[PDB]
């Protein structure tokens, strides 16, 4: 049998001494049936008065179900399973893939002797004056905190040898599922799949027969895995006449899932229906653009599109396009426009920003993703020119770096709509702003702002200045704030004011912004 | 094994492992597989919940680098720094981490040194290990091996008392004033003398630091032929700021040349009053502010500003405006330069105060977390937080 993992209760705490709820004599008789069997098999062992501990059992034909919450609150933490699942695009193509279900795996694995006592439960005796039978697990109790970690860990040492012996086969463990894959001629694959099952047998683990097995396509967590290709499960858009805030939020939800394989799915219009909504049941009439959006998505979705597997041998290419303002669509492929995956990116970091800046982040998101999925960073193809980047690059206070990339004259091309003069412009009128301004040529304008905030009045003055000034202007402000924002050279902002300035700025011939105490 | 414990009440670290590039992972597999055969480390089971992050840095050989920062913070203190070493002409840095790989680690602290070699696309559980010997990078190692170390060196120390030898973590700093040629010959004697005892590569290209030449990059004011309204406004701006440091700085006279809303480009002739005030301001600025002393009981902070063109400005202080040191660094790409800087600045802090400072980095975390280990070469890791450099603080620290 497999060596045992030593468990312990959390520091200080003591075993589960919880009372066994009353049990219907009809349930009591069915438990004795079940337990006796488990004992006959080695999983549990009758114990005595010695052990004070106890953990509630009840019946759910008839099946056993032990409540380990308390023990689970009292059991040490374990290096948990993984939470990080593989992503189809990361998988390599395979000829055959057999998935085996390790039936009662936790049950064919030993439990640390010194811990067995803490798993102590009790089957009440039918009649009043006579006491019932008391047990404790010899194996991994299903429902216990450390069973998955200890099962998997063990399953791994068991599989390690066989693994190092059969390098042409790869194995992925996932709960009770054992997925075996290879590029062997089906025949040898089915025989291998059968030695495996015999090596696991040489260790107590029992797998199903070739007749009860499972093969592609697999329907795993919103996906459809074929041996050579993958995709997301079939997705159908309703055709309602009446959409609720709830129906819409779920649609927007499934539409995002698709983003990973279907290029160009859009949810702007839809998401906008959720504005001001007052209840999860509130009906929202579809706007003209939302229907247009829904129709497009419906089409895109009608086409079945699959993603291919990772070819460790070929390079990764990530391509990024501006799908709109704040929106970017990318696709990672090894073979010419033959996707492994694709995706979007709306993320706006900071109230203000520019496509150059925003594109650069898209690159970082995509870079981190790749490292997680394929273990390497792709060669990027971006709609931006080296000199444009290099220009916003060295002039920005923050440090930043884009991997290896090549320009791709694929409109629209990210650009800079304006750049402040590095030196005060000669001959250009000069404005001193504060809600108003005063210029070197005697001009001035005061305006009484309503509802504004301190900082918002600052941007206003400036805006007011840009407004009345000519093509070339010089502005002096004290707002370190307005200064930073504008010095960061934004082209898009959540703020409307800032947006008007950005327009003013784009229209000017030359603008010099200066700060003073 | 000297029995060690975590500070009272503190549990072991449970730090997430940042994703690694398949290359780094492979390097880590080769290395850990070998340390395993050599019994320095051992695979562990699921009953160990702790984790410390690992990295592979870069000879063609790869160096494993465990980020024991969190663990060292929860690691009991143990119960000095040669102010002279900073004065020596040349300082060489030796990596003596291997001296540890031969001292068992208290059987019970082992669980705390757990680390994980990750897997690509989560296709495998990840290889889990823990140390059996003193791990490099752990705060406890230098201490526990201190004894055995002092022995090994007492000879050389006495044989070459003209030589200052400071150890810090996995690093040894050999300092002297000898000519460059004798220094390098002298170092090599130490290498074979550290070898005589047991397993020492050079650090920093086997090249030497010349702390003797390090110096405060003071604040400077624009010295120009003609002065426009803009120059002055910027001048007053920079001056007025620095006034919160040197209060003897006066702006009254320059601020008079700026009465009335004029045109930024208009050239203003400096009145003698203003002429001499600027003069006094330049002098006061000629040197670091008096009364700034290094408190050994406060955190050492280092802020770096990107000045563009491959130039960065930094300052080391414990109390705002009270800089203990300020400098510049010049070339690559933003990230590479940024990390080179961080390591330069640490090396000094150590050499000077034998303590690493806490950095405030002008970079996006995901970015830094993604490329730092591509250019990193030290065996230690400072504490670092990510910030947003104010537009004017960079303007008040640029050039000549
Ligand atoms: C076992 C190695 C992982 C692997 C699989 S696993 O079955 C797949 C692992 C994720 C969870 C469910 C199934 C795989 C499955 C299909 Cl259908 C096609 C290509 C594949 N290529 C691969 O590298």
Curated annotation (Swiss-Prot), chain A:
Q: What is the effect of changing residue 66 to T?
A: Confers resistance to d4C, didanosine, stavudine and zalcitabine
Q: What is the effect of changing residue 147 to A?
A: Confers resistance to pyrophosphate analog PFA
| Resulting phenotype, residue 172 to C | Confers multi-NNRTI resistance
Q: What is the effect of changing residue 227 to L?
A: Confers resistance to atevirdine and delavirdine
Q: Cite the effect that the entry attributes to residue 148 to S.
A: Confers resistance to lamivudine
Effect recorded for residue 66 to L? Confers resistance to HBY 097
List the signal peptide residues: none
Subcellular location per UniProt equals: Virion
Q: What is the effect of changing residue 80 to K?
A: Confers resistance to pyrophosphate analog PFA
Q: Where is this site: Essential for RT p66/p51 heterodimerization?
A: 392, 405
Effect seen on changing residue 51 to D: Confers resistance to stavudine
Q: Mutating residue 94 to E has which effect?
A: Confers resistance to atevirdine
Note the effect listed for residue 309 to F.
Confers resistance to delavirdine and nevirapine
Write down the position(s) of the site called Cleavage: 431-432
Q: What is known to happen upon mutating residue 66 to I?
A: Confers multi-NRTI resistance
Q: Where does Mg(2+) 1 bind?
A: 101, 176-177
**For Mg(2+) 2, which residues are the binding ones?**
434, 458, 478
Where can the motif Tryptophan repeat motif be found? 389-405
**What is the protein's known function?**
Multifunctional enzyme that converts the viral RNA genome into dsDNA in the cytoplasm, shortly after virus entry into the cell. This enzyme displays a DNA polymerase activity that can copy either DNA or RNA templates, and a ribonuclease H (RNase H) activity that cleaves the RNA strand of RNA-DNA heteroduplexes in a partially processive 3' to 5' endonucleasic mode. Conversion of viral genomic RNA into dsDNA requires many steps. A tRNA(3)-Lys binds to the primer-binding site (PBS) situated at the 5'-end of the viral RNA.
| Name this protein carries in UniProt | Reverse transcriptase/ribonuclease H
Organism, as annotated: Human immunodeficiency virus type 1 group M subtype B (isolate HXB2)
Q: What is the lineage of its organism?
A: Viruses, Riboviria, Pararnavirae, Artverviricota, Revtraviricetes
Specify first residue, last residue and whole-protein length for the fragment. 591 to 1124 of 1435
